[PDB]
Design a protein around this ligand. Sequence first.
Ligand SMILES: *[C@@H]1O[C@H](CO)[C@@H](O[C@@H]2O[C@H](CO)[C@@H](O[C@@H]3O[C@H](CO[C@H]4O[C@H](CO[C@H]5O[C@H](CO)[C@@H](O)[C@H](O)[C@@H]5O)[C@@H](O)[C@H](O[C@H]5O[C@H](CO)[C@@H](O)[C@H](O)[C@@H]5O[C@H]5O[C@H](CO)[C@@H](O)[C@H](O)[C@@H]5O)[C@@H]4O)[C@@H](O)[C@H](O[C@H]4O[C@H](CO)[C@@H](O)[C@H](O)[C@@H]4O)[C@@H]3O)[C@H](O)[C@H]2NC(C)=O)[C@H](O)[C@H]1NC(C)=O
Ligand SMILES: *[C@@H]1O[C@H](CO)[C@@H](O[C@@H]2O[C@H](CO)[C@@H](O[C@@H]3O[C@H](CO[C@H]4O[C@H](CO)[C@@H](O)[C@H](O)[C@@H]4O)[C@@H](O)[C@H](O[C@H]4O[C@H](CO)[C@@H](O)[C@H](O)[C@@H]4O[C@@H]4O[C@H](CO)[C@@H](O)[C@H](O)[C@H]4NC(C)=O)[C@@H]3O)[C@H](O)[C@H]2NC(C)=O)[C@H](O)[C@H]1NC(C)=O
Ligand SMILES: *[C@@H]1O[C@H](CO)[C@@H](O[C@@H]2O[C@H](CO)[C@@H](O[C@@H]3O[C@H](CO[C@H]4O[C@H](CO)[C@@H](O)[C@H](O[C@H]5O[C@H](CO)[C@@H](O)[C@H](O)[C@@H]5O)[C@@H]4O)[C@@H](O)[C@H](O[C@H]4O[C@H](CO)[C@@H](O)[C@H](O)[C@@H]4O)[C@@H]3O)[C@H](O)[C@H]2NC(C)=O)[C@H](O)[C@H]1NC(C)=O
Ligand SMILES: *[C@@H]1O[C@H](CO)[C@@H](O[C@@H]2O[C@H](CO)[C@@H](O[C@@H]3O[C@H](CO[C@H]4O[C@H](CO)[C@@H](O)[C@H](O)[C@@H]4O)[C@@H](O)[C@H](O)[C@@H]3O)[C@H](O)[C@H]2NC(C)=O)[C@H](O)[C@H]1NC(C)=O
Ligand SMILES: *[C@@H]1O[C@H](CO)[C@@H](O[C@@H]2O[C@H](CO)[C@@H](O[C@@H]3O[C@H](CO)[C@@H](O)[C@H](O)[C@@H]3O)[C@H](O)[C@H]2NC(C)=O)[C@H](O)[C@H]1NC(C)=O
Ligand SMILES: *[C@@H]1O[C@H](CO)[C@@H](O[C@@H]2O[C@H](CO)[C@@H](O[C@@H]3O[C@H](CO)[C@@H](O)[C@H](O)[C@@H]3O)[C@H](O)[C@H]2NC(C)=O)[C@H](O)[C@H]1NC(C)=O
Ligand SMILES: *[C@@H]1O[C@H](CO)[C@@H](O[C@@H]2O[C@H](CO)[C@@H](O)[C@H](O)[C@H]2NC(C)=O)[C@H](O)[C@H]1NC(C)=O
Ligand SMILES: *[C@@H]1O[C@H](CO)[C@@H](O)[C@H](O)[C@H]1NC(C)=O
Ligand SMILES: *[C@@H]1O[C@H](CO)[C@@H](O)[C@H](O)[C@H]1NC(C)=O
Lengths: 346, 66, 98, 320
Amino acid sequence: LSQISDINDENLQQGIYLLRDHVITLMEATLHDISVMEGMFAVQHLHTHLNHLKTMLLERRIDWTYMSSTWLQQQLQKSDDEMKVIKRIARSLVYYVKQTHSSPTATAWEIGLYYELVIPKHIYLNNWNVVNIGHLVKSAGQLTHVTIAHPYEIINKECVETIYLHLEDCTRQDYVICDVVKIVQPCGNSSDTSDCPVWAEAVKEPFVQVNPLKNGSYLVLASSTDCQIPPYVPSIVTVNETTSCFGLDFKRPLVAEERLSFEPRLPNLQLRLPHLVGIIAKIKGIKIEVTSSGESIKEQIERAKAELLRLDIHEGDTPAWIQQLAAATKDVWPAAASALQGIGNF
Amino acid sequence: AKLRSMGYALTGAVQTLSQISDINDENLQQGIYLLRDHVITLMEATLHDISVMEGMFAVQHLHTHL
Amino acid sequence: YYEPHPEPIVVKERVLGLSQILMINSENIANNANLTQEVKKLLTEMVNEEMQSLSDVMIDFEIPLGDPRDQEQYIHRKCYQEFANCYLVKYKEPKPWP
Amino acid sequence: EMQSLSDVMIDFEIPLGDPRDQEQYIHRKCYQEFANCYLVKYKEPKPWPKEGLIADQCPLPGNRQSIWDYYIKVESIRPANWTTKSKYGQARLGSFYIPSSLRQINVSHVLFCSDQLYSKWYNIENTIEQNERFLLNKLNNLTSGTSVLKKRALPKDWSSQGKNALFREINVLDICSKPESVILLNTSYYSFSLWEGDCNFTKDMISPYACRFWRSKNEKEETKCRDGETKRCLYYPLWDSPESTYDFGYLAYQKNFPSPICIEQQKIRDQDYEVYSLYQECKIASKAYGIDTVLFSLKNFLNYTGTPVNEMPNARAFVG
Ligand SMILES: *[C@@H]1O[C@H](CO)[C@@H](O[C@@H]2O[C@H](CO)[C@@H](O[C@@H]3O[C@H](CO[C@H]4O[C@H](CO[C@H]5O[C@H](CO)[C@@H](O)[C@H](O)[C@@H]5O)[C@@H](O)[C@H](O[C@H]5O[C@H](CO)[C@@H](O)[C@H](O)[C@@H]5O[C@H]5O[C@H](CO)[C@@H](O)[C@H](O)[C@@H]5O)[C@@H]4O)[C@@H](O)[C@H](O[C@H]4O[C@H](CO)[C@@H](O)[C@H](O)[C@@H]4O)[C@@H]3O)[C@H](O)[C@H]2NC(C)=O)[C@H](O)[C@H]1NC(C)=O
Ligand SMILES: *[C@@H]1O[C@H](CO)[C@@H](O[C@@H]2O[C@H](CO)[C@@H](O[C@@H]3O[C@H](CO[C@H]4O[C@H](CO)[C@@H](O)[C@H](O)[C@@H]4O)[C@@H](O)[C@H](O[C@H]4O[C@H](CO)[C@@H](O)[C@H](O)[C@@H]4O[C@@H]4O[C@H](CO)[C@@H](O)[C@H](O)[C@H]4NC(C)=O)[C@@H]3O)[C@H](O)[C@H]2NC(C)=O)[C@H](O)[C@H]1NC(C)=O
Ligand SMILES: *[C@@H]1O[C@H](CO)[C@@H](O[C@@H]2O[C@H](CO)[C@@H](O[C@@H]3O[C@H](CO[C@H]4O[C@H](CO)[C@@H](O)[C@H](O[C@H]5O[C@H](CO)[C@@H](O)[C@H](O)[C@@H]5O)[C@@H]4O)[C@@H](O)[C@H](O[C@H]4O[C@H](CO)[C@@H](O)[C@H](O)[C@@H]4O)[C@@H]3O)[C@H](O)[C@H]2NC(C)=O)[C@H](O)[C@H]1NC(C)=O
Ligand SMILES: *[C@@H]1O[C@H](CO)[C@@H](O[C@@H]2O[C@H](CO)[C@@H](O[C@@H]3O[C@H](CO[C@H]4O[C@H](CO)[C@@H](O)[C@H](O)[C@@H]4O)[C@@H](O)[C@H](O)[C@@H]3O)[C@H](O)[C@H]2NC(C)=O)[C@H](O)[C@H]1NC(C)=O
Ligand SMILES: *[C@@H]1O[C@H](CO)[C@@H](O[C@@H]2O[C@H](CO)[C@@H](O[C@@H]3O[C@H](CO)[C@@H](O)[C@H](O)[C@@H]3O)[C@H](O)[C@H]2NC(C)=O)[C@H](O)[C@H]1NC(C)=O
Ligand SMILES: *[C@@H]1O[C@H](CO)[C@@H](O[C@@H]2O[C@H](CO)[C@@H](O[C@@H]3O[C@H](CO)[C@@H](O)[C@H](O)[C@@H]3O)[C@H](O)[C@H]2NC(C)=O)[C@H](O)[C@H]1NC(C)=O
Ligand SMILES: *[C@@H]1O[C@H](CO)[C@@H](O[C@@H]2O[C@H](CO)[C@@H](O)[C@H](O)[C@H]2NC(C)=O)[C@H](O)[C@H]1NC(C)=O
Ligand SMILES: *[C@@H]1O[C@H](CO)[C@@H](O)[C@H](O)[C@H]1NC(C)=O
Ligand SMILES: *[C@@H]1O[C@H](CO)[C@@H](O)[C@H](O)[C@H]1NC(C)=O
């Protein structure tokens, strides 16, 4: 580019653009303070300045002493608060250091500094991290952990509207910096929501998971009841007096003062799973995709049907097979199950 | 445009203590507890060394500290 | 469920690249501060100490712009920093103080 | 240093209460602004009576003294038909001239901001954090709900009921270091003269320097020129010049040698002063109207003249 101002051209793309001509700077001219000081007082003031420049360059930071703020802001055409973000995330490189003259009473040096300024497109301040918990399902004898694959990683809420962000190609220069940020919709079974895939995985019984939250509640997911907490569905739990649940102590939290909230409120969602989800997850021995949020009854069924049909009766494990058929039939036809179970044990 | 982050004030509750000593209470949990009242500090009072120095010697000592 | 993410998130539009050349000269600093030949030696020791330390941990890198030696602003500010107040006077013919 | 830090840090909301509502924030802000600032009210307006000041205790120029700002120099070269009476009124050339700005007829109050009139309780040897507590207690002990000091606090010069609880008494050498202080606050003018003539002391009447007057009186004041009655003409003064000696009165005052000292009192102001504390008014008013207002209100009162008293040099910060 021929001018810093040219960086704001609307029909440029996302890349690196270099200013064509070097910026030439004499320190004598930059440091006014020293000019009016005398003797060793002048010498010690310069020492402090040179030692600070060295400290910044080791950390790959920019010392903004040697560049006018008014000039840079005028050229970039940004607000006071944008400039603060721009100056915090910029990074430096020292590409040469050369001594140009060396007498016993006189010296001269040259330094080549190369700067890379990230120009922001959007800045996001009020942000939450997603934590997938899921749900337990007990199917034809097998316990199974079920999870939704959400198309976002961050929820943002600046004022009243909630926003779901998908990030790509991110690094950390104090703040998080990303090349790609796509805005998405939460999962659902409708034309105006995302059609997300659903994963299942077989787990060992008994299953217990208790996470202490920071505000003093507890997050519980468990295959069995204790302290009146229902099984299989997860929940946020709070108690008015210290007690032992799932073999550990749930304490009463310290009274808090109420402030203005920014907590997100996701839409609710019903989800229909295949009847034999437990047998499908068991014969894979890995975490496997079983449906989408917004799938039809017909497509969902024609998905493990051929696989499942070919688990046929064999000469070598008829009793072990007959016991599976019963566990599979129990909810459909309880009379038949009790019969099959009998012919199993015979 | 005027930026201001709610990154440390996002949840809409706050648990406060009346003394630093209260942090060692045994029936507290694992969370963030704020001391209720601000700590107010004058630099003049903190930096004794400068008080007894004079002229530019005082000025250069403060520069190093800042 | 969710947990706070207190660090800001910046979306990148573009990157601007700059090259700055910093020129230091002790004699210019010694003239304004009315220094003596003893203190000139301190100024010179002090400046070398700091510059050399930086020189000793940084390898060179090629930067894909043109040579500063070809740029006007580099020629004008180098001639100034060396020869601003330097003049040559020629007598009509040689005659000394009598 | 502060601006550089300001330029890379965005703001963040922190979920505690406003500092402006907390006592420790109000008490330490009023202190940092108005600790040593006071207001004095004369019984009725009365200014310093003369434009000339005889003060031989101060050493003349020949450390730097503050009173040298008001010192009339005796010059050898003058213009034709030049007289002191034309320029410096009734002042004695080689002494001190008090300007008309320090002698206003309508000035009713004196506002000052310095820690150089405190009695022995205050010591710079002690710690800042002690010297704070010490003052903060005394000001609480010497007040009762308003910002008016109790008469006990004042020196015996300014009140009949004064016991030097807060302020010390102004002495003879204070004029040299702190001129405006004395000229605006002293109740009476005391002289200190080694000039031959004062109190009818004649050269015969005395019953290296030894027994001798500093400046003896000559026949008359005159000039003479050589066909150039404009710029450069010789001047013959009405008294002697102290340039050679310049330590006479200062060394005399300390009593290294005996000498015929002359001292005369002249009453200016009635010993019934009243003294307010701007630190105590800041604390009290901020409980009603809030600190943001009171701070801005009292900062303007310090700039009543057009130069703010709190930014003047510590020894010279006295205004009528
Ligand atoms: C530690 O931290 C955790 C958080 O991590 C704390 O847990 C959280 O605690 C909160 C309390 O501070 C809980 O909030 C409360 O939720 C209640 C239940 O909300 C649901 O039901 C509501 C009522 O539903 C019935 O009735 C309506 C008619 O009135 C019928 O239509 C229904 O069919 C039902 O019969 C319903 O309004 C709510 O709906 C909202 O949320 C769901 C998703 O959860 C959305 O799908 C909805 O669209 C809707 O959200 C939108 O619309 C509402 C307004 O309608 C907006 O507020 C939203 O922003 C959004 O736009 C739920 O289905 C509430 O009853 C309860 O209300 C109180 O507060 C309001 C004011 O805000 C008052 O008006 C009320 O009178 C009442 O006092 C409150 O909101 C959180 O649920 C809980 N979070 C989690 C994840 O569990 C925990 O406490 C902390 N622990 C400690 C120790 O500190
Ligand atoms: C601003 O205001 C302050 C007051 O806060 C003022 O400081 C005071 O200044 C006065 C005058 O200099 C000081 O008083 C004088 O002290 C002299 C020394 O005191 C010692 O000796 C006496 C005994 O002689 C002891 O009692 C005492 O304990 C000390 O040991 C003292 O010599 C002076 O006394 C003479 O002068 C007064 C004048 O009124 C007179 O009344 C006395 O009788 C006495 O005799 C006179 O002597 C002089 C020559 O010395 C002669 O000229 C005159 O004719 C004689 N008069 C007669 C009648 O014979 C006097 O008491 C006082 O200590 C200072 N106070 C403090 C607290 O330091 C400033 O000077 C003021 N500044 C300005 C610029 O206005
Ligand atoms: C996402 O959301 C979809 C939509 O809700 C869910 O799919 C639907 O599930 C429901 C509940 O299980 C099914 O309801 C049943 O509907 C039949 C009648 O179906 C016929 O008529 C429909 C008219 O709108 C039509 O859409 C159907 O078309 C589908 O099926 C045909 C044939 O296979 C196929 O060719 C098409 O391509 C479509 O796929 C079809 O013509 C009805 O008979 C059922 O009645 C029972 O239930 C009621 C209520 O309890 C009861 O009263 C009766 O006695 C009886 O017991 C029942 O209402 C619906 O068929 C499903 N629709 C589709 C399109 O599949 C899906 O489950 C959700 N997914 C997830 C992952 O959660
Ligand atoms: C489990 O959920 C319960 C709701 O079913 C929680 O009970 C609520 O807890 C709050 C705590 O702040 C109580 O508020 C207290 O109220 C009393 C006076 O009661 C009256 O006024 C309140 C409003 O202030 C009103 O809601 C009531 O109907 C009464 O008219 C005050 O003295 C306290 O200072 C405090 O403000 C609620 O009263 C209470 N609601 C109900 C319906 O009981 C319970 O805390 C939760 N338990 C756990 C373990 O988290
Ligand atoms: C380095 O030394 C030089 C040489 O002494 C300093 O220059 C001198 O600075 C003083 C103070 O500013 C000048 O004195 C004043 O000049 C003005 C204008 O004539 C006058 O109004 C004042 O009354 C006073 O005389 C002085 O002019 C100037 N030098 C000369 C020879 O005239 C310089 O300040 C020193 N640099 C420092 C301390 O950084
Ligand atoms: C800033 O300047 C003031 C004014 O000169 C300095 O205060 C003075 O400090 C000296 C040395 O500590 C004091 O002199 C000594 O006083 C004691 C006690 O009377 C005495 O025993 C010694 O023989 C000596 O005279 C002096 O009292 C004091 N000022 C006055 C007017 O009395 C202050 O130290 C300076 N601040 C610095 C350098 O930070
Ligand atoms: C103290 O008071 C003076 C006199 O009112 C103020 O002087 C004015 O300052 C402003 C600055 O913008 C000028 O525009 C005016 O022309 C000045 N007037 C005069 C007569 O000088 C001064 O600003 C006040 N200072 C403080 C610190 O409040
Ligand atoms: C002082 O006050 C008097 C009486 O109010 C008034 O006449 C006069 O104008 C004021 N100013 C001066 C400079 O005398
Ligand atoms: C002598 O001193 C007195 C003091 O009251 C004065 O009135 C008188 O004029 C003086 N006389 C002479 C001749 O100086």
